[PDB]
Structure formats: structure tokens, C-alpha cells
Amino acid sequence: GITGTWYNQLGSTFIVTAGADGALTGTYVTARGNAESRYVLTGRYDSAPATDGSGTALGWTVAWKNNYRNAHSATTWSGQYVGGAEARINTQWLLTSGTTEANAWKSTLVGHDTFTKVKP
Amino acid sequence: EAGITGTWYNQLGSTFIVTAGADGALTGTYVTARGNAESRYVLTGRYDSAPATDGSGTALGWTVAWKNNYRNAHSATTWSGQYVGGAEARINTQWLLTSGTTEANAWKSTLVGHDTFTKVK
Amino acid sequence: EAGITGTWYNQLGSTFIVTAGADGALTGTYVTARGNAESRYVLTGRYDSAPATDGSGTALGWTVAWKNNYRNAHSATTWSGQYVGGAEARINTQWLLTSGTTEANAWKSTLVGHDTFTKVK
Amino acid sequence: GITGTWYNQLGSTFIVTAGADGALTGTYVTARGNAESRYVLTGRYDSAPATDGSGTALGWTVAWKNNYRNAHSATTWSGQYVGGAEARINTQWLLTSGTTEANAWKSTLVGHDTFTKVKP
Numbered sequence A, D: 001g002i003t004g005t006w007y008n009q010l011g012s013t014f015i016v017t018a019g020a021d022g023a024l025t026g027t028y029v030t031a032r033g034n035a036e037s038r039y040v041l042t043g044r045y046d047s048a049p050a051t052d053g054s055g056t057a058l059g060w061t062v063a064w065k066n067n068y069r070n071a072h073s074a075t076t077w078s079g080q081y082v083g084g085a086e087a088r089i090n091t092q093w094l095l096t097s098g099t100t101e102a103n104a105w106k107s108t109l110v111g112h113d114t115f116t117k118v119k120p
Numbered sequence B, C: 001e002a003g004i005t006g007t008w009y010n011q012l013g014s015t016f017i018v019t020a021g022a023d024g025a026l027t028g029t030y031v032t033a034r035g036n037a038e039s040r041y042v043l044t045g046r047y048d049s050a051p052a053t054d055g056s057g058t059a060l061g062w063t064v065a066w067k068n069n070y071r072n073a074h075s076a077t078t079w080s081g082q083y084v085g086g087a088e089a090r091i092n093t094q095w096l097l098t099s100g101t102t103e104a105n106a107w108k109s110t111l112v113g114h115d116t117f118t119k120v121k
């Protein structure tokens, strides 16, 4: 299922536990950006997905502050888990940096990350 | 913290009750005015618990999976934004709403938008 | 058409002069108030030239590459939105700004935002 | 270069001409959605990209109306062209449908398309 260790196309590591009632909890390590070591993540997922072959909707957040660095930014990933032989989490994400009100127009990056359980 | 903690409404008439923990945790409950949903949903998120003191906003994000004891939309929204404090406190966000889809329909699985939250006294 | 055609400003103070052609073409010129840019830039786009008469907006989009005779930011913005006609005409958009990057930096190549355009008499 | 026939991961066909001064002009055929046959596209690209190995920024629009169908919607793709042995156009896109003002909150889909010159 969702619980396990995942890796995206950047080489980032996503270690997540899926709770019975819809909680996502875990640890993120990014291969890129103003960051080092582990960061706390929390999110939610659909704990009773539809039985028609549809993916499982989910989302999580990392605020990019830990004991080593603070980038003054946070990323949310929104996506779906697709099970089967080669499980995937396909996401699109938003990274917002803290900015002045005048710089808010350029505060948010958008991207997409695909996660698999295969180590780089 | 006490700044983020409280009751917020957005331009749709949705309501967001949140507690900002000392460790960077956001926890609480969301009621949407719109969509395939009713009653309260669990929210969880993170925020920068040591922001820049330079008049920059405080980065944060949270997610809601649209399943509670009453309804399941098979979808989830993440909001990514910043808290701007002061007398007229705001949380300015962009969001992604992803629905569970079949592989054939995954290309149209995700909506994008923007919500502005005003804190309620 | 004559509805879309004209001069528009957004909440940044940017200006958008456009002509909507009978064939669905949008053509004109954009001045941004912000970013790595100055003077006028070429815009080109498309719009639904036979929209629903049901009080739905008119879907459209346009792009600007931020290169003119004066400056090159090595970037381009696309706006995707709808025109809402009437006495207080608006074009409501979401946009993506992509900068040319090296492969190592492609993950942070794209900004997202939202602009509201008001038509000027 | 950019001029040529491209295909994305959905099987859509993108036939584009890149003009000397930054114009993109061409024809789009989609493998998915409320659409059939060719649609007109126009866009722009950076006609003097940086000489440091960076991709070429670009964007284009299709309004999903032709002689066969009208979906009352338009898509913009924003991205960069990456040249070399296996050229790519990597994009993220926004699809806005015409809606009432009250339904505007759910009017815009976001996604990502990767284009190559390889026929399906």
C-alpha cells in the first residue's frame, strides 16, 4: 500500500505511514533545494477509495525547517496512489516561500513528482 | 502560532479552524461551502515555526482528504500559502484538488485554484 | 470579440492591449509592472469564438515570451482564463511562468499565480 | 529545433512552426477530452535562449473549437524546449472551461505533458 519508502525522479526520499483512518505521517529528504537531512511531513489520504480501479487521492505538506536549515518555505503535494505490480504516487506540487506582500506574485513554484518504491 | 491559531473563512464561505503547534504542526477541521462534501473534515499541515522577522509572510500548507463519517468524495485538496499577520490577518493560498481517477482519466484528475482566508475575531 | 478587444489592467498594474479576431485569434501587446522586463511584449492567444449563451464565461488563453528589442528574461508566461462580459467586464486568469533552466534546475523552472484583468474605458 | 511534429504521453499530436522572431504557430490533435480532429494553436518562444545549456522557454494556447466540436474551453501549455539527441518539450498546462461565475472555483484543471518527436 501507501505505507513504505518512496523515491521521486529527483532522488528525494519519502518515508510515510498511512494510518487506518486517513492520516499520513512521515519524513522527507530532498535531493534538491535549500535543505539537508530529514523534514517532518503530515498529510491525509482517502482511506476508503472507490472499488472501480480508481487511484487513491492524497496530499501532504513539508515545511522546510529542521535542526540544520530553515528555507522559510513549504511544499504541498497533491496526487493519487496507484497500486499494483509497480505502485506509483503521481503528484503535482506547490512550493510557497515566505515573501513580502509586494513579492507575493512570485512566491509559489509549481511542479510534478512521480514516486516509486525503487531505490535510485 | 497564536497568530495562525483560530477560525478563518475564505471567499467561498468555507471555514478553517486550526491550531498551530510549537513544533510546526497544523491541526484542525475544515468545512467547505462548495463541492461534494458536508460537515467537518480533518485537516493536517505544517508551517514555518521560526519565520523571518523581516516582514515576510509565514510559509505553510495543509491537506484535507474529503472523507468523513458522512461523505466520501474520493478526493483531496492541498493548500500552499503564507500567513500574513497583524490587525487584518490573512492566509493567502494556492491549492490543488486531486480526485481519484482511472489511469485513462488521470490527465483530468487535478483542479487548481486560489483561496484567501480572513481571520475571525 | 469587440467585448474582449480593448485595453485591460491587472492588479499588479500591468497592461494588456488585445484584439480578438473573428477566427478565434488573440493578438496584441503586454506591459508588465513587475519582473525582469520593460517596454511592450508581443502576445498571442486563442479564445472560444462561439461561447455558450448561458451566462458562462468565454474560455481563452494567451502567451508572452519575455523577449523584445530591449530585454530578454529567458522566460514565458501563459495565462489561462475566462472573459466575463457586461458593464464591469473582467478576464479572470491563472498563469504559469516558465524560465529556461539547466536540467539540474528544471524542478524550480515554473511559477504559478492568478491575475484579474479589468477593462478600461 | 522546435519546428516539427511532436507527441505527448497521451498520444496527442503537436505540429508546430517556430518563426525567427519568436512566433509559434500550428495544429494540435488531442487523444483525450471532448475534441476531435485538428485545432489551431498559437504561442511564443524565446528566440534567443541563453548560451549556458539552459532550455528554451515557450508557451502556446489551443481553444477547443473547430468545425466539428466546441468544448467551450482552452488550454495553455507553459514549458521549455530541451534540445540534443532526444529533444523534449516539457510542459505544465492549465485547461480553463467557460463556467458561470459561481462555478469558477472548479473551472481550471492543471497537468503536465512531455512531448517527444517519437511517433506512438
Ligand SMILES: C[C@@H]1NC(=O)N[C@@H]1CCCCCC(=O)O
Residues within 6 Å of the ligand: A008, A010, A012, A030, A031, A032, A033, A034, A035, A064, A071, A073, A075, A093, A095, A097, A111, A113, C107
Ligand atoms: C518539491 C520538489 N520535490 C522534491 O523532492 N523536492 C523539491 C522541493 C525542495 C524544496 C527545498 C526548500 C527550498 O529550497 O525552498
Ligand SMILES: C[C@@H]1NC(=O)N[C@@H]1CCCCCC(=O)O
Residues within 6 Å of the ligand: B010, B012, B014, B031, B032, B033, B034, B035, B036, B037, B066, B073, B074, B075, B076, B077, B095, B097, B099, B113, B115, D105
Ligand atoms: C479548494 C476549494 N476551496 C474550498 O473552500 N473548498 C474547495 C474544495 C472543495 C472540494 C470538495 C470535495 C470535492 O468536490 O471533490
Ligand SMILES: C[C@@H]1NC(=O)N[C@@H]1CCCCCC(=O)O
Residues within 6 Å of the ligand: A105, C010, C012, C014, C031, C032, C033, C034, C035, C036, C037, C066, C073, C074, C075, C076, C077, C095, C097, C099, C113, C115
Ligand atoms: C504573470 C505575472 N503577471 C504579470 O502582469 N506579470 C507577471 C509576469 C512578469 C514576468 C516578467 C519576466 C520575468 O521576470 O521572468
Ligand SMILES: C[C@@H]1NC(=O)N[C@@H]1CCCCCC(=O)O
Residues within 6 Å of the ligand: B107, D008, D010, D012, D030, D031, D032, D033, D034, D035, D064, D071, D073, D075, D093, D095, D097, D111, D113
Ligand atoms: C491538456 C491535455 N493534454 C492533451 O494533449 N490534451 C489534454 C487537453 C484536452 C482538452 C479537450 C477539451 C475539453 O475536454 O475541454
